[PDB]
Amino acid sequence: GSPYLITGIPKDPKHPLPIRKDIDDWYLEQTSAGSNRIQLTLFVEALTVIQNRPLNDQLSYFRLAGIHGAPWTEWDGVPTGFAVHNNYTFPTWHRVYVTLYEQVIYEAMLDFIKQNVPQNGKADWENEAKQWRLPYWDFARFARDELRLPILVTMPMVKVLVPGQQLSKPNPLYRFQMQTLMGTLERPYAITDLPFDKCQSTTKYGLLENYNADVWADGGQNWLRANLALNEHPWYQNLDGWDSVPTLQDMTFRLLTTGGLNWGEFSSTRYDAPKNWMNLEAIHNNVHNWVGGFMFSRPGRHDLKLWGAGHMSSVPVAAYDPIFWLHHCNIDRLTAIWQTVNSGSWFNDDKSKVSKDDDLRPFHRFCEKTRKVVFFRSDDVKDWRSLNYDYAITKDASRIRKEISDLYGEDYILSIRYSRYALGGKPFQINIFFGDVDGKDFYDARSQNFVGSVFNFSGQEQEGVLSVSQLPARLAVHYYKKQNKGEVPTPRYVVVNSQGKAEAEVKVEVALHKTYRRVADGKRAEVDDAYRA
Amino acid sequence: GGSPYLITGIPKDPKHPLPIRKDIDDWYLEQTRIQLTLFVEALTVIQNRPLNDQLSYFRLAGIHGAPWTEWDGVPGGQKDSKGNPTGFAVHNNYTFPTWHRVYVTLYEQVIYEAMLDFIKQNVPQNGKADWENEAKQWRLPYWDFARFADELRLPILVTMPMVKVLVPGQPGKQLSKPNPLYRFQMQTLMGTLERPYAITSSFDLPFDKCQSTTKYGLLENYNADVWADGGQNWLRANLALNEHPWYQNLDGWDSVPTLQDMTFRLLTTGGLNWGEFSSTRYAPKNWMNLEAIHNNVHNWVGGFMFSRPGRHDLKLWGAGHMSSVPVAAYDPIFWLHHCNIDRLTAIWQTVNSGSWFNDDKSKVSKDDDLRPFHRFCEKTRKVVFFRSDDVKDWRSLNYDYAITKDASRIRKEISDLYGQRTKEVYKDFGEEDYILSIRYSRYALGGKPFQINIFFGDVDGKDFYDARSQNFVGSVFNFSGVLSVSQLPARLAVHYYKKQNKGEVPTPRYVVVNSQGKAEAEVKVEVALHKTEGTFYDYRRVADGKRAEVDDAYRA
Numbered sequence A: 001g002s003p004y005l006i007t008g009i010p011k012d013p014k015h016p017l018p019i020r021k022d023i024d025d026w027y028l029e030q031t032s033a034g035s036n037r038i039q040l041t042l043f044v045e046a047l048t049v050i051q052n053r054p055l056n057d058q059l060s061y062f063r064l065a066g067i068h069g070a071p072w073t074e075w076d077g078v079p080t081g082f083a084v085h086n087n088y089t090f091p092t093w094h095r096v097y098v099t100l101y102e103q104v105i106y107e108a109m110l111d112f113i114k115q116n117v118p119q120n121g122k123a124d125w126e127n128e129a130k131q132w133r134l135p136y137w138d139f140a141r142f143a144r145d146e147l148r149l150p151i152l153v154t155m156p157m158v159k160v161l162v163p164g165q166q167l168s169k170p171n172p173l174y175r176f177q178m179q180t181l182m183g184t185l186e187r188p189y190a191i192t193d194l195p196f197d198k199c200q201s202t203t204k205y206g207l208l209e210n211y212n213a214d215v216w217a218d219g220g221q222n223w224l225r226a227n228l229a230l231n232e233h234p235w236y237q238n239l240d241g242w243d244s245v246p247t248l249q250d251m252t253f254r255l256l257t258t259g260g261l262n263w264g265e266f267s268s269t270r271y272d273a274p275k276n277w278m279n280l281e282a283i284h285n286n287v288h289n290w291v292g293g294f295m296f297s298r299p300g301r302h303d304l305k306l307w308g309a310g311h312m313s314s315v316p317v318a319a320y321d322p323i324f325w326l327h328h329c330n331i332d333r334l335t336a337i338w339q340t341v342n343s344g345s346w347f348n349d350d351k352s353k354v355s356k357d358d359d360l361r362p363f364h365r366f367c368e369k370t371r372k373v374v375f376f377r378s379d380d381v382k383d384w385r386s387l388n389y390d391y392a393i394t395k396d397a398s399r400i401r402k403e404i405s406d407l408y409g410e411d412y413i414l415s416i417r418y419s420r421y422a423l424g425g426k427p428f429q430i431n432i433f434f435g436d437v438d439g440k441d442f443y444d445a446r447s448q449n450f451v452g453s454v455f456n457f458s459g460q461e462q463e464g465v466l467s468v469s470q471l472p473a474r475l476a477v478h479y480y481k482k483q484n485k486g487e488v489p490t491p492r493y494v495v496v497n498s499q500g501k502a503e504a505e506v507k508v509e510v511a512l513h514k515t516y517r518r519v520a521d522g523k524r525a526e527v528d529d530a531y532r533a
Numbered sequence B: 001g002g003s004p005y006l007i008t009g010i011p012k013d014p015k016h017p018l019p020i021r022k023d024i025d026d027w028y029l030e031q032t033r034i035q036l037t038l039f040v041e042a043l044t045v046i047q048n049r050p051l052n053d054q055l056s057y058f059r060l061a062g063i064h065g066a067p068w069t070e071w072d073g074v075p076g077g078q079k080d081s082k083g084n085p086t087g088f089a090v091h092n093n094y095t096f097p098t099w100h101r102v103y104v105t106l107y108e109q110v111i112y113e114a115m116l117d118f119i120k121q122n123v124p125q126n127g128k129a130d131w132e133n134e135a136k137q138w139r140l141p142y143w144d145f146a147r148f149a150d151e152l153r154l155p156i157l158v159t160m161p162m163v164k165v166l167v168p169g170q171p172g173k174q175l176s177k178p179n180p181l182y183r184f185q186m187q188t189l190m191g192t193l194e195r196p197y198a199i200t201s202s203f204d205l206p207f208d209k210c211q212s213t214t215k216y217g218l219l220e221n222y223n224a225d226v227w228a229d230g231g232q233n234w235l236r237a238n239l240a241l242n243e244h245p246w247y248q249n250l251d252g253w254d255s256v257p258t259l260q261d262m263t264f265r266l267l268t269t270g271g272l273n274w275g276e277f278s279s280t281r282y283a284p285k286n287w288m289n290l291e292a293i294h295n296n297v298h299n300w301v302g303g304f305m306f307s308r309p310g311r312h313d314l315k316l317w318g319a320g321h322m323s324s325v326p327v328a329a330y331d332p333i334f335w336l337h338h339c340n341i342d343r344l345t346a347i348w349q350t351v352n353s354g355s356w357f358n359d360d361k362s363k364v365s366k367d368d369d370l371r372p373f374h375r376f377c378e379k380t381r382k383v384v385f386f387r388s389d390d391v392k393d394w395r396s397l398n399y400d401y402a403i404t405k406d407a408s409r410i411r412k413e414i415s416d417l418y419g420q421r422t423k424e425v426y427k428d429f430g431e432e433d434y435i436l437s438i439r440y441s442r443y444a445l446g447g448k449p450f451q452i453n454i455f456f457g458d459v460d461g462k463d464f465y466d467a468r469s470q471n472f473v474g475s476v477f478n479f480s481g482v483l484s485v486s487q488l489p490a491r492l493a494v495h496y497y498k499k500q501n502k503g504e505v506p507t508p509r510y511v512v513v514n515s516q517g518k519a520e521a522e523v524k525v526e527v528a529l530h531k532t533e534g535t536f537y538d539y540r541r542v543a544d545g546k547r548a549e550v551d552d553a554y555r556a
């Protein structure tokens, strides 16, 4: 049935603008309030059916994930993937993509009810399906002292109700598992420096060099290691007994509360000022890295192994991990929040205006004005409510500033300008330090003097185009001055590849700014010979 | 079928002379397929058997501990006047190796029988003879926890959630199936199983809230539903398995895994009697024993700490079934661990052949019934319980090991497998040896488990836990819950300390750690450091141990 018309869940008067809930709040409601976990059952059962549909079914989990990147085939009659990255339509392309997923799941819930619920209970189960929306993962909220992956994502199994008659079933949010290695799928669907061709299941930090290749078939879900990455902060805050602040929460707070940005500044890493370089896509890029892992190996000798790679860090395959959609649900929510407090800023600066009318292929919609099938466009989804969902935080804009502070609440900042194609398109991580760099340990918050990272979510650039990100630096500069006779630090950086080696030929523009004036220029730090690319 | 289950080992076949139990990594690698298929399919059936089936995985694991029910007509245990559960398994006694020798054989036999049933139900005429031949040649593989996989590791196959198997009748077809060696999973939380089988209680970990076995998966302050299946943190287990002194992670120093050094000592040290070798039950040179090394591996595989005081972003704690005597038999790796413990017993027997229940203390236990395991006595024509003498020669159970196939070659194979790294690094330093002796009461914390960590030099009052902890030397784990003894190598850590301390011999400092990560100040441990001239491949006490204090917030 093509074209598939994306609409959002249809309107029903008994269900006015239902909200997409925080997935932890929702999980707790469903399992705690009492035993009637009907929405949890519906989502589990429907997503399981979708994951088990065949590859020639374009509404299969695999084909839905395939729209984003590999294996780069057609979708819905529409012949680098469809996904928009490093352009101003990044938020709107993904807004439609998340709505497509939600709609397909709702439709499969209705099918589950027709299949498994007795007549006399159908109205009760239909009511719950019509009230459900895709929950979001609030990656910047403290879990019910630290940031965490959703409760439900960390559960291999989940208890469900059996209509008419609980029962434990594999949790389709934990992983996506195929019946064979993805590199051996039928043409044209096969997925063929990270061994994704040798995976049967999606994995978080599961792929490491120097283990039997059969381990890569399912490398597991190292959610504790992802939670550690998610709470990245400067190294000094782990010292006895300084308090820590997760950089991701600070970045999210600043993104939502800094005023003045135009749509082009907010929407994307694309650079075609530095104070306005904290953008939605850059934060989204670091979260992809922190959930999945991107380093397959590390040089040298190490007892504790903190590396390991996984689907969410890799553009061509990230959409196969079920948390992809929950991450993007919150990116949609952050967009809606920022729209609410920046209500005039929508593709109307000189750089982003050109992209406003881009067709958001491959997504189809019917137009009422021509009674014609057309592609989605950004203006079609400016009001997300037109798609019949909302967020609690935007339903009531009156004290939105208060909820933002309640949730995520001289200045110094780091600016970072880079090419996504500095390594021919391969991903890399830009790590910044204040002070001497350890030539064998230049990786993460456990690395001496580490301040923060910028992840290049990629896998030549458009001429004239680069990418930007921004890191908070106030707390780290204060510590460094204290330790270093009041010296303002020279930012040192290392560009790290998926083998954990430093790429010395890569030039990145790193600078320190203070309230903003430029006070120090970044320099590349050298590492040990053995750790050099 | 209303009759005692007679344990015999896999029945004898002339075309299959004393088949060997293989190293499970070598066995897997030379298949990465009928034997693999047979083991996966048979164990899957056994795991999915109902609780009323005495040959179900659950009831076979149940023999060892909780939920302390009957098996094969033999009444199950109860808490004593003491308030301690009483079950079948022997720990802290000299029959520890022989009770577990029979238990491992029971498991192997049940699997073989399930292999034959699988062939009768699934294999076509053409392949039945070849499949039956592989079942008859198969023996339970062992996990060589002390052999390098560079580093020690959990078996490849234990780290794989799925495994590909052959499909009889479909030449070349293979199917990916859940790996029964990865975990054991039940249909509901074990705390709510039908009576009398619920896992409940005291326990200090939420095992009543698990549906599946886990390695390092249980941590405080996560949603209780995460504990239903905490996952298999096999990388964390490998890290624990490679425990060594802290100083060896410093630049300019070479490392040796303590487990490999301990196992090499165990096998090469002469002059121990059976009572010394067989058990923790209690000169300190002879305190390096089989049960103590086995207790440490249980800890390292499973983890025992549920929490840690204060705030830590990197969380190195986490608990799981293998650390806990009442539920450890539910993890499929339990059987592979105990297969190697059987192999180490056989190797040691081979190079100490007159040392069988040969001392005054163990002699008194030689004749104990090894309940609940039945066999038929030919001399009396009665069904009786196994006794230790029945399994002195493991080959009477119709299995063998490659290393015990030739006595004349066994000392060289021991050095080639377990001694080359120790000798490589010890050879860089003077001709002396140092060892730590450790004596404690398994009852010291009301029966709860605990870990004894030893340090040379100052102890970090917020980090007294593992190889990443400043000045850590090694650990001793109280698995079992009369005293108990263990020994640690100390030669390399003493050398490091002397070089930092103008040649002073270190005072061993100890901390007793509970499951909450806190220091127990009233558990008694006797620790001492001993020296001899000459490498180990006449000890005298050179220092007395002392309890270390920790930060106020880290005190029990």
Ligand SMILES: [O-][O-]
Pocket (backbone or CB within 6 Å): B091, B328
């Ligand atoms: O001993 O298990």
Ligand SMILES: [Cu+2]
Pocket (backbone or CB within 6 Å): A068, A083, A084, A085, A094
């Ligand atoms: Cu994308």
Ligand SMILES: [Cu+2]
Pocket (backbone or CB within 6 Å): A284, A288, A328
């Ligand atoms: Cu994304």
Ligand SMILES: [Cu+2]
Pocket (backbone or CB within 6 Å): B064, B089, B090, B091, B100
């Ligand atoms: Cu035991």
Ligand SMILES: [Cu+2]
Pocket (backbone or CB within 6 Å): B294, B298, B338
């Ligand atoms: Cu044991």
